[PDB]
Chains A and B, each alone.
Chain A
Amino acid sequence: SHTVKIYDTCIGCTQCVRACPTDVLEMVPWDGCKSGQIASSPRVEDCVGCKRCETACPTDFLSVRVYLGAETTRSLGLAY
């Protein structure tokens, strides 16, 4: 459904993965930052488009960007 992309400016603060309401983001090993960790979006099929993740990023400009797109039952948050 929606598209979430992570950029090299990430600092591995883990704040984004701790804010997702649907477990779409994970922290994976990396060497480009001091923390030695980067964020990934393995399960974008469950993204609802809340953008809470973006609100949590501390980088000058979001290192995590959510681009809204095709809509499915899951993305539209339909319990019915």
Chain B
Amino acid sequence: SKNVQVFVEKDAVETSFAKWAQPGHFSRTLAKGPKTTTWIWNLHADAHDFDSQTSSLEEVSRKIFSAHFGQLAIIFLWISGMHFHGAYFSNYSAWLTDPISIKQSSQVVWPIVGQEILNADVGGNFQGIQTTSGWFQMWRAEGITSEVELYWTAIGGLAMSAIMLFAGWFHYHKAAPKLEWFQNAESMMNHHLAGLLGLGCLSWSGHQIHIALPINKLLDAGVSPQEIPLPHEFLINRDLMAQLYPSFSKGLAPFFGGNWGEYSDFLTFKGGLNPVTGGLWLSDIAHHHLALSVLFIIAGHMYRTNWGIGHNMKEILEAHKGPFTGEGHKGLYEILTTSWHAQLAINLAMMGSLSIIVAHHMYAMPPYPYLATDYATQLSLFTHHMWIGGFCVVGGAAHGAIFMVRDYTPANNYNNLLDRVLRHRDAIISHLNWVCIFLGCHAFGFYIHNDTMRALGRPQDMFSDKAIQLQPIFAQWIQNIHLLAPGTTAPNALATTSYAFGGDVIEVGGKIAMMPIKLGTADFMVHHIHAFTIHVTVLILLKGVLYARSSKLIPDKANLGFRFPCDGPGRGGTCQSSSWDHVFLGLFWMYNSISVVIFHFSWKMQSDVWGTITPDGAISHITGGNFAQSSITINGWLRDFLWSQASQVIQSYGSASSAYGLIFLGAHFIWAFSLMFLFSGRGYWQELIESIVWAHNKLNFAPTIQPRALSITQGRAVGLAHYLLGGIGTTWAFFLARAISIT
């Protein structure tokens, strides 16, 4: 009948604790029982690989839907806890009254073992750990005002968490959807693009227009939090709103009529940052979401469902083919509607890419009240979202490779774009290799050249703004374009989207919130290094996807799998030739890439933006503008950045920042610890274990689960894990400790 219908099987899986007591039930091999320690590790590594646990897409699909509900439940509990801790263990009320002086804190340590030192004198007759997630600013923007409200949102969160968990159980054990239900992309996109995003934005705009905007205006004006009317009061008494925004008097009459102009009071396109709080005007944010909402809702009506009108994605994809691309995009629809791994690849890459964009756009255009001046929170958020993004992007590549090895079928892909790509893979990889070498030699060479020149007493031969100069002309041009846009290419706007492009210095509380950021030779040099790092990462990852099934070296790599240790010592050596290993190596380069980016942000900002400005025009940046002539050499980074900005962590003992010092050291230890897994091999360890077991046997006792050394692949994984934790952890402490002081 209808193309789109709901098909669900009742009572699919019985709920019992029997399987719980039978570890390894999901796998046929593991189910037999443990005979060596490898079984234990394998149990945990194959837990969520449903494709290998079952051969039916319906079953795999059912598990994924329910598992997702589980994650949602966890996320809800997390958010709930944060709000609760902000209601019972925080100084929000005090901060709300004096946001500039009091420091945000929402965690308190018990008075055990001198750990109390960690409870700092943040302010407002309160002692606790200074948090840096930015909760206080967000709550202020929403218009919380009280701590009772925080408690209630916490309760809502707990309730929501439970509902999600029930949903997971219900849709797996009692009402499990069939495969036909899952395979309805057009419907899903229509619903998610119009309901989840469109209605979501519209609903949020409602809160912002009726509750947040009014309260925040009063707060900024000076009204004491206690004197601001309760949220419900604004919703009921239109007169009160009319006082603040003199258009609510007209009511919704202007809206139904075409006179949307009358609502210019609260819907505006001002641009720039609020002078008092140093954040984007909420009026603009309200119009933003309202506009986006309309767009999304309209977009949700593009695909056919059950009424004839609409587009069928298959047709659109197949029609787009050209002279240089054979059958074009034929075959892609089936792949994306019959392979979860393929979908995850695209989705995961885009999600990670978004996080990186959020990081850039959220510092240049501060979105929350009193966020820019809080340097600690700004740095924390930028770095946090930069990382999340990197991991996700690499993950997308990984799952893309899993697709090629597990779901790719030659029959369904003849002369399509995918086939043609795999037919000239040598050309693609060869060229990218060259691009990477070119960029790397030229970009890093600049730094080495400068180091040598400065050391040889020849400063006039350096690539600097005072010698041979490499100016970023293109970027400088775009900046000017964006600066002059308000009033020209953007006539109805009133100010620059960001003061970074150009403008005046916005200061809040004697501290600089935003200032024009200029680009010179040093910036050129660093930006091109970023390009090199990203390009190399792509090379490793793309090579893995393209050569996943076969290679000149190992023609039958596909049969070996996605995660095999090697093929042997032959052919000169075939170690680490799997696609999994390419992901393994890619993560190391992603670490390098992100590390450089976050360091660039930290030094540039502390040198050319952040700081204090006097009543008159005197700007004193935190580091003093050293970036221009010091970041052009490697010695400069080691001395004027790492060595100098690390004075805080190393001298944190005896203070509330002591934890960071300990973690800094601990992270270094873990990083080094990992190098033993990354440089050694299973053979040595297995033999050592044999001798150790001899001792236990000599005393008449030994485990039946014979002790064995970690697999080759696991060894690499353990090493990478500790390596990443240690490296990121070290910077984490370094940044946070430094930031607390600079703030």
Interface residues of A (CB under 8 A from B): 2, 21, 47-52, 68, 71, 75-77, 79-80
Contact = CB atoms under 8 A, between A and B. Distances in A.
A48 B552 contact: no
Contacts of B572: 71, 76-77
A77 B567 CA distance: 12
18 contacts: A48-B568, A50-B568, A50-B570, A50-B574, A51-B568, A51-B569, A51-B570, A52-B567, A52-B568, A68-B569, A71-B572, A75-B570, A76-B571, A76-B572, A77-B552, A77-B553, A77-B570, A79-B552
A68 B325 CA distance: 46
Contact of A68 (B552, B553, B567, B570): B570
B687 interface: no
Central interface residue in A21, A47, A68, by most chain B CB within 10 Å: A21
Nearest to A47: B570
A49 B567 CA distance: 9
B405 to A, nearest CB: 18
A58 B4 CA distance: 55
A49 B570 CA distance: 4
Nearest to B568: A50
Majority-rule SS of B interface residues: loop
A21 B574 CA distance: 14
A38 B711 CA distance: 32
Interface in B513-571: 552-553, 556, 567-571
- 8 cross-chain pairs, A with B, having the tightest CB-CB distances, nearest first: A49-B570, A77-B571, A50-B568, A48-B570, A79-B552, A51-B568, A50-B570, A76-B572
A44 to B, nearest CB: 12
A67 to B, nearest CB: 11
B559 to A, nearest CB: 10
A50 B552 contact: no
Contacts of B552: 77, 79-80
Central interface residue in B556, B568, B570, by most chain A CB within 10 Å: B570
Nearest to A2: B570
A16 to B, nearest CB: 14
A68 B570 CA distance: 8
A79 B571 CA distance: 11
Given A77-B571, A77-B572, A79-B552, 20 more contacts: A2-B570, A47-B570, A48-B568, A48-B570, A48-B571, A49-B568, A49-B569, A49-B571, A50-B567, A50-B571, A50-B574, A52-B567, A52-B568, A68-B569, A68-B570, A75-B571, A76-B571, A76-B572, A77-B570, A80-B552
A2 B569 CA distance: 12
Interface in B256-299: none
B388 to A, nearest CB: 40
Contacts of A49: 568-571
A75 B570 CA distance: 7
A52 to B, nearest CB: 7
B414 to A, nearest CB: 25
Contacts of A75: 570-571
Contacts of A77: 552-553, 570-572
Contacts of A21: 556
A65 to B, nearest CB: 13
A79 B572 CA distance: 13
Contacts of B553: 77
A7 B567 CA distance: 24
Central interface residue in B556, B568, B572, B574, by most chain A CB within 10 Å: B568
B324 to A, nearest CB: 28
Contacts of B556: 21
A8 B730 CA distance: 58
A47 B569 CA distance: 12
A2 B570 CA distance: 10
Nearest to A66: B570
Contacts of A47: 570
Contacts of A76: 571-572
Nearest to A49: B570
B427 to A, nearest CB: 15
Contacts of A79: 552
A4 B552 CA distance: 24
Nearest to A54: B568
A79 B550 CA distance: 13
A80 B551 CA distance: 13
A50 B565 CA distance: 13
Contacts of B568: 48-52
Contacts of A80: 552
A76 B569 CA distance: 10
A71 B573 CA distance: 12
A51 to B, nearest CB: 4
Central interface residue in A47, A50, A51, A76, by most chain B CB within 10 Å: A50
Contacts of B570: 2, 47-51, 68, 75, 77
A56 B580 CA distance: 24
Nearest to A77: B571
A71 to B, nearest CB: 7
Interface in B349-397: none
Contacts of B569: 49, 51, 68
A18 B728 CA distance: 48
B572 to A, nearest CB: 5
Contacts of A51: 568-570
B569 to A, nearest CB: 6
Nearest to A68: B569
Nearest to B570: A49
Central interface residue in A49, A52, A75, by most chain B CB within 10 Å: A49
B350 to A, nearest CB: 37
A52 B567 CA distance: 8
B557 to A, nearest CB: 11
Contacts of A2: 570
Contacts of B574: 50
A71 B553 CA distance: 15
Contacts of B571: 48-50, 75-77
A2 B568 CA distance: 14
